[PDB]
């Protein structure tokens, strides 16, 4: 069933990451580890083969190449702290591949966003899609942006000419419970 999860037409933003539930089906993670297409194939708590768990979750989103290192237990940064946090005892795999040819636009893509401000860090597997104005100062914002009142989401602006570290990457996080 992975065919429609990896080769999907459009992925979700990292702040609004999508979760697909996969329970008891056909799977062969041997053709994925052997693939140079996947820039990242790293598993935690299990070594990358044909074991058995009751359920599989497929979390998918898009970030940039420099941020793929944050999709791992015990990491800090924009993505790990404000967008997608993996627990320390995470048991699963993280898979990523360069999606520049799909998610990058000349002049910048406006469809993929990431949370820029948040007063506290996300709990593991917490999903925050609120668009409340971030109050950075003591003075309360009343829904209007300004000094110390910033919009919490920012656009990646993916461009094909960007450095590979700033190019879009589609990430799939498989967790086994």
């Amino acid at each position, epitope marked *: 069933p992975f065919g429609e999860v990896f080769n999907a037409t459009r992925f979700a933003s990292v702040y609004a990451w999508n979760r697909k539930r996969i329970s008891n089906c056909v799977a062969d993670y041997s053709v994925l580890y052997n693939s140079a297409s996947f820039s990242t194939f790293k598993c935690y708590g299990v070594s990358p083969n044909d074991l058995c768990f009751t359920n599989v979750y497929a979390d998918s989103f898009v970030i940039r190449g420099d941020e793929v290192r944050q999709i791992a237990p015990g990491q800090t940064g924009k993505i790990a702290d404000y967008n997608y946090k993996l627990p320390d005892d995470f048991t699963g795999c993280v898979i990523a591949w360069n999606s520049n040819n799909l998610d990058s636009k000349v002049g910048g893509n406006y469809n993929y966003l990431y949370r*820029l*401000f948040r007063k506290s860090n996300l709990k593991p597997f917490e999903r925050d899609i609120s668009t409340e104005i971030y109050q*950075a100062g*003591s*003075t309360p914002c009343n829904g209007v942006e*300004g*000094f110390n009142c*910033y919009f919490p989401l920012q656009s990646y602006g993916f461009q094909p000419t960007n450095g590979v570290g700033y190019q879009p990457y589609r990430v799939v996080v498989l967790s086994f419970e």
Partner: antibody, heavy 123, light 109 residues
Framework: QVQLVQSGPEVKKPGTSVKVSCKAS????????VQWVRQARGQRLEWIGW????????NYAQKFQERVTITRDMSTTTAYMELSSLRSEDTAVYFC????????????????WGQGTMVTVSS | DIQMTQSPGTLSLSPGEGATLSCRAS???????LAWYQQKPGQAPRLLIY???SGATGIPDRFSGSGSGTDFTLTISRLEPEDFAVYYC?????????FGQGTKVEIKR
């Protein structure tokens, strides 16, 4: 040492461009903002524009919309002010100002200021 | 834009008196987004008061601030010799963040 250090003095010919630097220290640059103000010798303070360090979003004054672009680089904790097509009227001292902030909250005004950068434009 | 006008132009006062400076806005501005600055010759502006009535860090308590909407005040209870400089008011609520034209506080003689 909550500091804001600017570039050295500049002397350019008319029709060229100058890029003044402004580097932060002490506070966490990533969550503050930096405004730019110019002052001609013996004149008042003129607000040029500001930038939000995290997003890079800018707002400029009407009179600088045409020749000033403000940028920042969070890696080098520095904000810049590019001034294209210089002329004698641009001969002034330029200041950078920012609120100091920790990782989540900010001061409620522009309390940190740079030393100032004098830009001389003539032939 | 919001025009900020200051008065008086020059404040000629003796050391030890009480200074009073005014800052007017062309339209009502939020009190929490107005500041006062002090600038001495050859130096950068220094923040004194913000939020109309909130003393900055390190500023002496003889510096006070009041006002609301279109009219704001910077009161100096007892003027010290290190206080004779130029004073500016800036609103940073509505863009652009306009400045006032300044008030010179000189030692009267």
């Amino acid at each position: 040492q909550v500091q804001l250090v600017q570039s050295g003095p500049e002397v350019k010919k008319p029709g060229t461009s100058v890029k003044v630097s402004c580097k932060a220290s002490g506070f966490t640059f990533t969550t503050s903002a930096v405004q730019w103000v110019r002052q001609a010798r013996g004149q008042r303070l003129e607000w040029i524009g500001w930038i939000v360090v995290g997003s890079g979003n800018t707002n400029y004054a009407q009179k600088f919309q045409e020749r000033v672009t403000i940028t920042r680089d969070m890696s080098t904790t520095t904000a810049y002010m590019e001034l294209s097509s210089l002329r004698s009227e641009d001969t002034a001292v330029y200041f950078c100002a920012a609120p100091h902030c920790n990782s989540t909250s900010c001061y409620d005004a522009f309390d940190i200021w740079g030393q100032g950068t004098m830009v001389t434009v003539s032939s | 834009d919001i025009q900020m006008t200051q008065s008086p132009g020059t404040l000629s006062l003796s050391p030890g008196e009480g200074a009073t400076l005014s800052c007017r806005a062309s339209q009502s501005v939020s009190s929490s987004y107005l500041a006062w600055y002090q600038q001495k010759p050859g130096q950068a502006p220094r923040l004194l008061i913000y939020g109309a009535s909130s003393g900055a860090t390190g500023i002496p308590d003889r510096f006070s601030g009041s006002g609301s909407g279109t009219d704001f005040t910077l009161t100096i209870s007892r003027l010290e010799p290190e206080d004779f400089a130029v004073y500016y008011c800036q609103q940073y609520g509505s863009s652009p963040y306009t400045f006032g034209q300044g008030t010179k506080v000189e030692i009267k003689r």
